[PDB]
Design a protein around this ligand. Structure first.
Ligand SMILES: [Cu+2]
Ligand SMILES: [Cu+2]
Length: 213
């Protein structure tokens, strides 16, 4: 099959948050059937980033999800042709991130071409002031609507010292060919970072994702 037990990852993100432009490139690897992946990210333009890196990390591929045999796998079926996704993250203080990604496959490597725009973040809020400390673990509700797969998360962005900000995710995942469509289900995520310098010039992200009925 085209999705091997061990796959590699290359990515590029072009982004703009509150007007600040940047480029990030990443290289990594994962185990698509185990639902695990890791990516090493480097800021290539725009360093040091003047905002929270956590609003970028979930943009850095549901092909890396453990799926039970009885739930059709929208993402793995889409290959070799691939899929793309479009996501809106709405923050409780009216900040908003819109991000899109195109996921393709070259040999044994997934390639992500990502574009991200963040706007309307309060200038002295925790995002622009770099006061976040990662994401909680989460549950994404997956469901078919208008012939494509949608995912919703009621997420929590953790704040240094205490508490969190609520962030709603709405994602549309679009296979590039017809695939067998799943019934509604859940994907449980845990995204984490290795300890990093506050400049965030180099960051390693890890994610685990498991689907369940
Ligand atoms: Cu094969
Ligand atoms: Cu950080």
């Amino acid at each position: 099959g085209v999705i091997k037990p061990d796959m590699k990852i290359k990515l590029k993100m072009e982004g703009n948050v509150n007007g600040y432009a940047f480029v990030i490139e990443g290289e990594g690897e994962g185990k698509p059937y185990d639902g695990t992946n890791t990516i090493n990210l480097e800021v290539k333009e725009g360093a040091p980033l003047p905002f929270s890196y956590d609003i970028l990390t979930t943009a850095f591929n549901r092909a890396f999800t453990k799926y039970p045999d009885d739930i059709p796998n929208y993402f793995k079926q889409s290959f070799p042709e691939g899929y793309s996704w479009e996501r809106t993250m709405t923050f409780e203080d009216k900040g908003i991130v819109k991000v899109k990604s195109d996921i393709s496959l070259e040999e044994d490597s997934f390639i992500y071409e990502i574009y991200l725009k963040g706007e309307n973040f309060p200038p002295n809020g925790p995002v622009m002031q770099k006061k976040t400390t990662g994401w909680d673990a989460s549950t994404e509700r997956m469901y078919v609507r208008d012939g494509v797969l949608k995912g919703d998360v009621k997420h929590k962005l953790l704040l240094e010292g205490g508490g969190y900000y609520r962030v709603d995710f709405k994602t549309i995942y679009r296979a590039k060919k017809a695939v067998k469509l799943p019934d509604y289900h859940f994907v449980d995520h845990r995204i984490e970072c290795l300890n990093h310098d506050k400049d965030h010039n180099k960051v390693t992200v890890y994610e685990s994702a498991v689907a369940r009925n």
